[PDB]
Amino acid sequence: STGSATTTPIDSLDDAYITPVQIGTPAQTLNLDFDTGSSDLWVFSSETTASEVXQTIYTPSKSTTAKLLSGATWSISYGDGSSSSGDVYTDTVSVGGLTVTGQAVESAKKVSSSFTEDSTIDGLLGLAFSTLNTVSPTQQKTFFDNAKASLDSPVFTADLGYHAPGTYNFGFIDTTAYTGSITYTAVSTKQGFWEWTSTGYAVGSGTFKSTSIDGIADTGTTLLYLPATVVSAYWAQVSGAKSSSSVGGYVFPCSATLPSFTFGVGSARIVIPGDYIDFGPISTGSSSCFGGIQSSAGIGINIFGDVALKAAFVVFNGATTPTLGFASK
């Protein structure tokens, strides 16, 4: 089997991307943030404290296929400080026409304020490795892990758009969605992520520096977070750019024509166009824009988030020894 679903930016800044997910019988359609940096499928629900709901909710008692997973609970927090917790059902879940039975659906009893505040995100669908799942006492498998037995190939692909709709595919590689060929690189699962080592980088039309960059492919992070020295080298080529203590990163004049940023995948190169690195105005109508490449020093891990991923066609190869593929597009 295969599935193919459209993923859409939630706002004008490409802050996040949502993808429809059908849960239960009859199907309840929720828009979830597909997140290759975590491993829980959790939803706003009829269980969620009412004052914390502003979203479409899952009601397990309206689904004939929902089963309570007795004794199971979950609690998660994210790098940006947000959190949620609750209890666990198994139910039928479909993405893009691909159906899994027995998927753990983590029903939120409570959600943090940033979740309440974002009307567009009805929950998360984690796509990192199942070892990061937060259900206790027994961790639960991701949607991808449960799908692998039936998929035509144990893969999924991310084709995120720049201010445009894009696609998540499960079980096949669409050869018409990219140019050139895919280059694969090794993945370490020791921290539960799609963690890999980039072979280096270049700024604009300058030289490629072969300094290894260990980081994670994370569709649930907006920006590209790289080592301080790399980020400094990038913004050195932007004459109005400076680090802003108060705003929380590099800011630059919105009228700048930004250089591209190239990262290495083995011998291959993925080029992020300059305008992808313009995240957007600090506030509507500002003359200052926030950079899309920021230092990873505060977060402690390099993150190839959406600014990077949306420049590529990305293959998450979940064979027993997983790998990550990148192609230009």
Ligand X SMILES: CC(C)(C)S(=O)(=O)N[C@@H](Cc1ccccc1)C(=O)N[C@@H](Cc1c[nH]c[nH+]1)C(=O)N[C@@H](CC1CCCCC1)C(O)(O)C(F)(F)C(=O)NCCN1CCOCC1
Sign of the Cα pseudo-torsion (214, 218, 221, 222, in order): positive
- What would the DSSP string read from start to end of 67-94? EEEEEEEEEEE-TTS-EEEEEEEEEEEE
Applying CB under 6 A, among 228, 247, 299, 319 the residue interacting with ligand X is: 299
* Residue 118 interacting with ligand X (CB under 6 A): yes
* Residue 38 interacting with ligand X (CB under 6 A): yes
The stretch among 19-27, 52-60, 71-79, 87-95 that binds ligand X (CB under 6 A) is 71-79
* Residue 78 interacting with ligand X (CB under 6 A): yes
- Which of 158, 206, 166 minimizes the C-alpha distance to 326? 158
* Residue 223 interacting with ligand X (CB under 6 A): yes
Q: Would you call 94 a catalytic residue per the annotation? A: no
* Residue 35 interacting with ligand X (CB under 6 A): yes
Applying CB under 6 A, among 107, 221, 262, 302 the residue interacting with ligand X is: 221
| 7: its two tokens | 């993923």
* Residue 308 interacting with ligand X (CB under 6 A): no
Distance CA 282, CA 274 (A): 18
* Residue 33 interacting with ligand X (CB under 6 A): yes
* Residue 45 interacting with ligand X (CB under 6 A): no
- Which of 12, 8, 37 minimizes the C-alpha distance to 20? 8
Virtual CA dihedral for 28, 30, 36, 41, nearest 10 degrees?
A: -50
Q: Would you call 174 a catalytic residue per the annotation? A: no
**What would you report as the CA-atom Rg of the chain, rounded to the nearest whole angstrom?**
20
Answer yes or no: are the C-beta atoms of 223 and 292 closer than 8 Å.
yes
> 55 φ, ψ to 5°?
-70, 160
* Residue 52 interacting with ligand X (CB under 6 A): no
Applying CB under 6 A, among 30, 32, 43, 76 the residue interacting with ligand X is: 76
Give me the 165-204 binding string for ligand X, x by CB under 6 A, dash otherwise: ----------------------------------------
Positions annotated as catalytic residues are 35, 198
Instruction: Write out the residues near ligand X by the rule CB under 6 A.
Output: 15-16, 33, 35, 37-38, 76, 78-80, 82, 118, 124, 132, 134, 218, 220-223, 299, 303
